[PDB]
Design a protein around this ligand. Structure first.
Ligand code: A1JNG
Length: 230
């Protein structure tokens, strides 16, 4: 499997591909990653990859020819998935990460451009994906985050919040690890962790409690808690 990124700043990805999961999986002969710069396929008078929009508008638009050429050199096939980092795209999701981990070749089109030529979108892009309602400067960090979640799904819940976890030391600033965790009584350790899960969910995410098949023990735990409050 292989991932290629079209970027103006191929060096933003320095140290994110040479370390962690990217370093591991790429070393392991699992994924080939290539960075590709624009303006390496530009032919404009200033070697530009953006020009002004027909009809007017404030911004500048990425031109189609450098991008189709970039797809050409990257040996994009009819089954390659070309992902446009688009602020109005479908929000990225675990479902989509599972879907994309099934893909032999992937290309991210990254860029700060206010606009993209519609030719690119109609005949080149297979996928347009957002990071969320917030506004970013470019598609490079989105591209890398999505790559993280996808690569992690390469061969290389219960409905509640997590239970608190503690490690050494037992005491720190007078803040004491709960004693049940050191008693070596695993039935109590698990019962306590479950109680904390119910209580933390009740306090911070009551919607999750509503969608949870509460037992009679769970109801009693929450009721003893909310009475212990008063
Ligand atoms: N087309 C416009 N407005 N570009 C402006 C500059 N920009 C933004 C993005 C972008 C990519 N992915 C995102 N996910 C969530 N919000 C975002 O803003 C983005 N890429 N370039």
């Amino acid at each position: 499997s292989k991932i290629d990124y079209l970027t103006l700043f191929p060096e933003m990805f320095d140290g994110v591909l040479n370390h962690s999961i990217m370093k591991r999986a790429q070393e392991n002969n699992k994924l080939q990653i290539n960075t590709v710069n624009f303006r390496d396929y530009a032919i404009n008078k200033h070697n530009q990859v953006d020009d002004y929009p027909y009809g007017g508008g404030q911004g500048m638009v990425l031109k189609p020819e450098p991008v189709f050429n970039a797809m050409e050199d990257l040996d994009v096939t009819e089954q390659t998935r070309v992902i446009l980092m688009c602020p109005q795209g479908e929000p990225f999701s675990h479902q989509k990460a599972v879907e994309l981990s099934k893909a032999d070749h992937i290309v991210f089109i990254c860029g700060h451009y206010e606009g993209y030529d519609e030719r690119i979108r109609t005949h080149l892009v297979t996928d347009e994906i957002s990071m969320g309602d917030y506004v970013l400067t470019g598609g490079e960090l989105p591209a890398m985050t999505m790559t993280d979640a996808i690569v992690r799904l390469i061969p290389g819940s219960d409905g509640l919040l997590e239970f608190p976890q503690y490690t050494r030391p037992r005491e720190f600033k007078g803040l004491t690890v709960p004693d049940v965790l050191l008693s070596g009584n695993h039935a109590n350790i698990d019962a306590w962790r479950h109680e904390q899960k119910l209580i933390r969910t009740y306090n911070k995410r009551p919607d999750l409690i509503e969608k949870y098949p509460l037992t009679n023990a769970d109801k009693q735990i929450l009721e003893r808690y909310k009475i212990g409050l008063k």
